[PDB]
Amino acid sequence: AGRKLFKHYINENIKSNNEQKLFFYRVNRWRWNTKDNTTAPKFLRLKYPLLVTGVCLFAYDWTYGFTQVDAHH
Amino acid sequence: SKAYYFVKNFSWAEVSNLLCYGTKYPTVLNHQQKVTRLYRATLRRVYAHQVEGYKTDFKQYNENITDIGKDFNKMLALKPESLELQAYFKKYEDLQEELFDPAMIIDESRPYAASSGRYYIFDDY
Amino acid sequence: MSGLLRNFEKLVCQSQLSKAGHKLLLRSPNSTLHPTAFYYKRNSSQRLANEMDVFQLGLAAAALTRQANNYAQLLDQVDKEAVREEVQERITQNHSDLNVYFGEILSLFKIGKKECPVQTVADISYVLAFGPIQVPNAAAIITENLLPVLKEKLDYASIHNLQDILSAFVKLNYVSDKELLKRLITALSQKDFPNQLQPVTNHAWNIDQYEYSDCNSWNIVSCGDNTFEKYIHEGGCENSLAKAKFAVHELLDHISFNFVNPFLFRENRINHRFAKRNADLDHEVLMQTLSKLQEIVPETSEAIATIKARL
Amino acid sequence: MLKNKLIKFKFFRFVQSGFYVDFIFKKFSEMFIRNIFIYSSIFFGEKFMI
Amino acid sequence: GDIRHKFSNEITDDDYDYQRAMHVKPPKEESLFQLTNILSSVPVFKTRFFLDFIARNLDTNSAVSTSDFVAPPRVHENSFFVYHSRELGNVIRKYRSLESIVLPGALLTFTYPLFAAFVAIPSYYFMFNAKIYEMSRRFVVRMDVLPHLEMISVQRIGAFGILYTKLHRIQDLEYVPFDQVKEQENYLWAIGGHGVDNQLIFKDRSTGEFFYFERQGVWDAKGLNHPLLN
Amino acid sequence: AGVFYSYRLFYSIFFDTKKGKKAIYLQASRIILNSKFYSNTSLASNLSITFLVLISYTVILYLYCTTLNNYYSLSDLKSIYINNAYSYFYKPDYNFLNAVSILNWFVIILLISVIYLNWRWSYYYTKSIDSLSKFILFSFFFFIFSKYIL
Amino acid sequence: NYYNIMRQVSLDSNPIVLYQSSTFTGNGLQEFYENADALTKYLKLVPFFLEKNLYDHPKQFVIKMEFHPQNKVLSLDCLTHQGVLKKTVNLENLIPVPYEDYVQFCRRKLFNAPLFLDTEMIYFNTFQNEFYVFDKNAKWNEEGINHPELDISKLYNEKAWFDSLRII
Amino acid sequence: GGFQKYPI
Amino acid sequence: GTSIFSRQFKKAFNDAKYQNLTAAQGETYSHLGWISNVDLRLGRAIFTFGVVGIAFCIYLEPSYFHETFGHMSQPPKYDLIDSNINGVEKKLNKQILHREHNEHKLDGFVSMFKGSDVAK
Ligand SMILES: CCCCCCCCCCCCCCCCCC(=O)OC[C@H](COP(=O)([O-])OCC(O)COP(=O)([O-])OC[C@@H](COC(=O)CCCCCCCCCCCCCCCCC)OC(=O)CCCCCCCCCCCCCCCCC)OC(=O)CCCCCCCCCCCCCCCCC
Ligand SMILES: CCCCCCCCCCCCCCCCCC(=O)OC[C@H](COP(=O)([O-])OCC(O)COP(=O)([O-])OC[C@@H](COC(=O)CCCCCCCCCCCCCCCCC)OC(=O)CCCCCCCCCCCCCCCCC)OC(=O)CCCCCCCCCCCCCCCCC
């Protein structure tokens, strides 16, 4: 009954978004290239480093691991 | 721009005038020059804080620049001797002051910037 | 959705949800879809008309009338006088509140504020018919105030509202508008009943995923159990165990309304316990109204038969 | 806590500027330099006393 | 533009293959130890036992959405739905459900429950309350309209993931511009308001309660165009 | 305070969204530069940094063995003031052992904040909250199994 | 601000087939099991389904795609670890995405993909926030795809195609 | 990297 | 003329979604197609060294874990020497060993408490 509500304000928001200029989007498109950026967990891979770590720990266990004393607390 | 805001013992009013408009005496400027320079300064500062900033949000940047552009279009339409235009100028000067950042990035292509005069070029004489 | 060593035969497939008119009903915990007790203010610092609307006053009046009728049934079916004194006192309080609320409603209608939802028409009709207070001319006020609103918003009418409107019209002999009565009958016949509706409940922390279930969900926000009815039926004031149980129930209700609903669920409107509608009483009233309508309007016999079949 | 003033750029730049300690010290040092090395020493000292 | 081929000792894509772990390129060949190669080679996985285990013991296709139009079950026999939240609602439900397992489990397992509570209190008051909890309290899981009452039923997630529905009159709904609340609740919108729409906030004037709608939420065209809401 | 500056420096320099001038990236992304010699730094610089890190690790380990080991083998410091501080390094008591946990958990909460806290809208907001919930619940269950169920 | 408003579309009478995978051409997961190529491709996709489930990567391997021009809706038959499912998509909600965008949408390092997963032809439903991946060994209906309703001149939107999905 | 060379 | 689902148009869009429109055609690409080989090798080597160091810290110095999460259940560790003897001999010897262990713990406690005055 002539009351401003969800539909009215959704249309208002759509109009506000449409009023934006595509010039800024066009000039900045290059920034968010997926081929050029990734995440820190993806870049820092621990697969083979953990394998080398396991080798080193195994060597320690079978060389100096025997000569250790249990410390219960 | 000479980028000498923090040198030569500028007062706060002079520094604010330099940031908003290229000149230290905006009264000499005409209406179009004032509006265009203030719009450029506002866009530059918004880009510095919401594009090249800390965890910047590009959607918020777009919305903010759109609102600023509409406001500055209205300002340009308005007559020079209008309290509404004066209020707009005060609002955006306050925004510039709010976004003022000590140690803000100064491009190396401007005078008085870091690395501006690291080398002395020898003349043909 | 996701499971291990499990079968999802009882899960509701997304195909039905994608389809339209799938006849699925949702039963969720702590669901309060009826606004009774929202606008029931025992003490008013000012005139109720100033603060509340006709819709709110009608909801309160209908709730009070139903509670008073239930307590009158308790009086009829109870024998011991000492236990009957409490029932009489509660009935007197309900009658006083109903009188003040209905006086405010009449004053508002006289003033000229009449726009209200369909449930307001239903509640005013159910207060005029089956209500303690008597008005010199109920038909005139129904015609002047409620009739145009009912004609305009009959489509929005619910099953309960249609049943109440038909029952009130039969009781008051307000059957002058045969076309309107036929319109109400056909609307009720077209409506969809809980027998056809298929209840479902949320599945495994998933709002989107639903499972068929025939078990009602717990509702601490508004409990439909009639603790007072149970207390009167079993023992009473004389019975120490019944008195202790009723005291515990009243203390729990007070604690809820005063601390749980505001702090938890952020709701302060509910402050009084109104028992849920009696299914047996509703069924009997509907059957009687349909029987009366069969004689009153011969051409609606098929509609009444279909309504009875769906029921 | 729904309203936090510490996330605002005013507090951010205050902390980033080292609490304005350098600015305050530089202003006081300028006062000392101007009063002692010019007005009191050169003019009052050399021009008047000497 | 590339001149690597002009030299015999220049690096090659075969030399760059080792960067595929840290660099995203479309697959070129399958190594002997890839999951796909292992599954397709080892005959054990071809056994009907393993195939049936895969078919049954995992996420079912029934819960998978099958269309861009959703008609959730009606809350009331006469109501019609308008808005519903898909993913953020489930995420909030699962987060608030932790209070039914972590909290009693923490009490019965931690050596110092008081220490845990003392650590949690300031954690809740800073960076957690405004981050998730207030947004969840004001979050709208579902919205339907009851026309006979001319009301709107809103479903919300409570403590421990409990779902409760409340009624609000359409005459008591108002639109609250984001400018009027941004300064009041800057922190809330700073760290937790991203999921919900900033410019589509409504509130009930009588009860002073807000309604946050998910950005990735489904709206019904018919529900929006219904005359009651217009 | 160390956590915040370390995180900000590392993340903003390397893994944040590209904020620098287009020239910085384009001048180095040209295909002509693709070569076995390609690098934006110096090989000598990389080797110098690597050797510095290795030698620093070795020297720090040597000093730790000299001082913090059960057998004290450091040379004389020519000071006659004994502080008794080594008592809480050799035989710490329950009070101090639990006191250190306060700072440990403060650092843990700060790490969680700098990692899972969102300041800008993203396509991964809901999935980030979900990942936080998964991490919390998995941490609880893993602790339960490690301490009691084994 | 883009809002997911639903239009309640329905299928038409005679659809036009646009995509048909040469493998999985049979009907039913039982037929896939009994067929040699289908079984091996299913085993190779098992990691794909694992990524779907545990890594919360919304994606679907699409086969036997049909188009309804009367209502402008695509009916997709998708293969999941449990069987074949039918889904409906509106052309207004479908946009193309690069393979790197598809990979970077998920924050977990995806398993090494098989060689029959067409990387060029990856599409994105914005309404469902989902990806559709087709099979390289497939047959495309040229006349079907050349339908007027599928033309970019009518389905093109710069803001939606280029700025809707910003993974960062 | 470094500055452009100029005559001395 | 062209329509979606066309391979050529799809490839063009995939390559041009994040292009630099201010650059000439054929050179309007923003991504880096590789990573410095020598730099990546050295970086991965040093990263592996750091990871190995962190793991050795975790293993040989669990003090942080002990004081941040508490002492977790220890995996079983015992010797099967007692299985050599069987019967009443085994029972009596096991009881004697248990008594000796308890007495040893008490002796350590009392010795620690008493020996406060050993150093004069
Ligand atoms: C780029 C990143 C930038 C950085 C981002 C950082 C993000 C985190 C930010 C927050 C981190 C903390 C920052 C520092 C605090 C900032 C405070 C602030 O700004 O508030 C301004 C705000 C006013 O401005 P505003 O515009 O309203 O601000 C908006 C609100 O913040 C809006 O609030 P709201 O409406 O949304 O509701 C929240 C409300 C409520 O929020 C809370 O309460 C938060 C939870 C507080 C937990 C505190 C735990 C402390 C640890 C020990 C106890 C652990 C529990 C143990 C078990 C229980 C106890 C046994 O907030 C508050 O009221 C203020 C927070 C509490 C500040 C307390 C500051 C210390 C007080 C003095 C020391 C007390 C400790 C013991 C001292 C012992 C002797 C040395 O409130 C204040 O005034 C601050 C407190 C002023 C204290 C004055 C001096 C004391 C007053 C007299 C006391 C007399 C006692 C007599 C006793 C007699 C006995 C016989
Ligand atoms: C040989 C046999 C084995 C030997 C023993 C070892 C066995 C275990 C090996 C475990 C190896 C590490 C595994 C990491 C997996 C990460 C991916 C994952 O699981 O995703 C699910 C989940 C993340 O989900 P999401 O969807 O990616 O997160 C949503 C974000 O919006 C997404 O973020 P965004 O993309 O928007 O960008 C923000 C970025 C922010 O990322 C960063 O800024 C750093 C990213 C580092 C990635 C990991 C590289 C390896 C470093 C750790 C090496 C292992 C240390 C020991 C770990 C176990 C200790 C008990 O976010 C992240 O990357 C968060 C995920 C990384 C979590 C692990 C962080 C470790 C370093 C601590 C924070 C350092 C802050 C200062 C900056 C560092 C440089 C100064 O991972 C988590 O569980 C997060 C936990 C976060 C709180 C951890 C607090 C731990 C406090 C107690 C332990 C303290 C000692 C350890 C730290 C000491 C200093 C280095």
Ligand SMILES: CCCCCCCCCCCCCCCCCC(=O)OC[C@H](COP(=O)([O-])OCC(O)COP(=O)([O-])OC[C@@H](COC(=O)CCCCCCCCCCCCCCCCC)OC(=O)CCCCCCCCCCCCCCCCC)OC(=O)CCCCCCCCCCCCCCCCC
């Ligand atoms: C009789 C047969 C019995 C068979 C028993 C098999 C038992 C299997 C148990 C598996 C338990 C779970 C393992 C999970 C691993 C992934 C964890 C993870 O990433 O989560 C964090 C994840 C985030 O991490 P993200 O990096 O983003 O993940 C990306 C992908 O995961 C992509 O991840 P990524 O590729 O970046 O790295 C993931 C990696 C993680 O791997 C590691 O970290 C382990 C590193 C090695 C440790 C070795 C220790 C033992 C040996 C010590 C050294 C001995 C030296 C001896 C002397 C040598 C002398 C030279 O996964 C593995 O563990 C791979 C297996 C290790 C293969 C190589 C082992 C060494 C072989 C011998 C040396 C030769 C190596 C190759 C050649 C090298 C060059 C010459 O957080 C999540 O969100 C997790 C969500 C849940 C995902 C679950 C997916 C799997 C679901 C499986 C369901 C059950 C299936 C049952 C089938 C049964 C059929 C019958």
Ligand SMILES: CCCCCCCCCCCCCCCCCC(=O)OC[C@H](COP(=O)([O-])OCC[N+](C)(C)C)OC(=O)CCCCCCCCCCCCCCCCC
């Ligand atoms: C100075 C005073 C200090 C006081 C400190 C107080 C600390 C203690 C606080 C106690 C909190 C109690 C929380 C109750 C949680 C339930 C609340 C509720 O109604 O939610 C219903 C919710 C929601 O109910 P619903 O009806 O909406 O739906 C049912 C559930 N779904 C949604 C899936 C359909 O249901 C649950 O969450 C059920 C939880 C059941 C299990 C609860 C105990 C789990 C932990 C067990 C002990 C730890 C593990 C031990 C392992 C041993 C292995 C050998």
Ligand SMILES: CCCCCCCCCCCCCCCCCC(=O)OC[C@H](COP(=O)([O-])OCC[N+](C)(C)C)OC(=O)CCCCCCCCCCCCCCCCC
């Ligand atoms: C008694 C009132 C109710 C208290 C409820 C409990 C607090 C609120 C819920 C906490 C849930 C998170 C529990 C994580 C348990 C991790 C393992 C552990 O150390 O447990 C034993 C320990 C305590 O067991 P304890 O007391 O036997 O340990 C010995 C004592 N200390 C450790 C001090 C030497 O757990 C904790 O210390 C928890 C501290 C409270 C955390 C409050 C929330 C902040 C963290 C956000 C959630 C994610 C944390 C991830 C941590 C990952 C590892 C660094």
Ligand SMILES: CCCCCCCCCCCCCCCCCC(=O)OC[C@H](COP(=O)([O-])OCC[N+](C)(C)C)OC(=O)CCCCCCCCCCCCCCCCC
């Ligand atoms: C005289 C005694 C000498 C003792 C030397 C002790 C060395 C101690 C090293 C401690 C760890 C420090 C690592 C520093 C960096 C070097 C490691 C590194 O960069 O790892 C990353 C690298 C790669 O990191 P990445 O993950 O970036 O690489 C992935 C790409 N590809 C697949 C190509 C590798 O890790 C590995 O390559 C894993 C190696 C695992 C196997 C380790 C043992 C190798 C043994 C070789 C000799 C065998 C002789 C056999 C003789 C038989 C005779 C019959």
Ligand SMILES: CCCCCCCCCCCCCCCCCC(=O)OC[C@H](COP(=O)([O-])OCC[N+](C)(C)C)OC(=O)CCCCCCCCCCCCCCCCC
């Ligand atoms: C240019 C190249 C130059 C040569 C390169 C050489 C590479 C580095 C070689 C390092 C060799 C020594 C390794 C020691 C490993 C740690 C030992 C330890 O925990 O000490 C326990 C010893 C045993 O002590 P304790 O048991 O007698 O008593 C300790 C006393 N309380 C109990 C009170 C603490 O403890 C200490 O002495 C204190 C050590 C504190 C520092 C812990 C550091 C942990 C990280 C180790 C990183 C190792 C380097 C990186 C990995 C290298 C892999 C090859």
Ligand SMILES: CCCCCCCCCCCCCCCC(=O)OC[C@H](COP(=O)(O)O)OC(=O)CCCCCCCCCCCCCCC
């Ligand atoms: C001494 C207390 C020690 C800590 C106790 C923790 C109890 C946890 C269970 C709470 C159950 C009731 C919740 C009620 C919600 C509600 O509607 O709460 C409504 C209330 C009242 O409304 P207002 O305060 O906004 O006006 O809001 C509050 O802020 C007060 C209650 C706060 C309860 C917070 C519970 C979450 C704690 C999270 C700890 C940090 C994270 C831990 C890892 C995940």
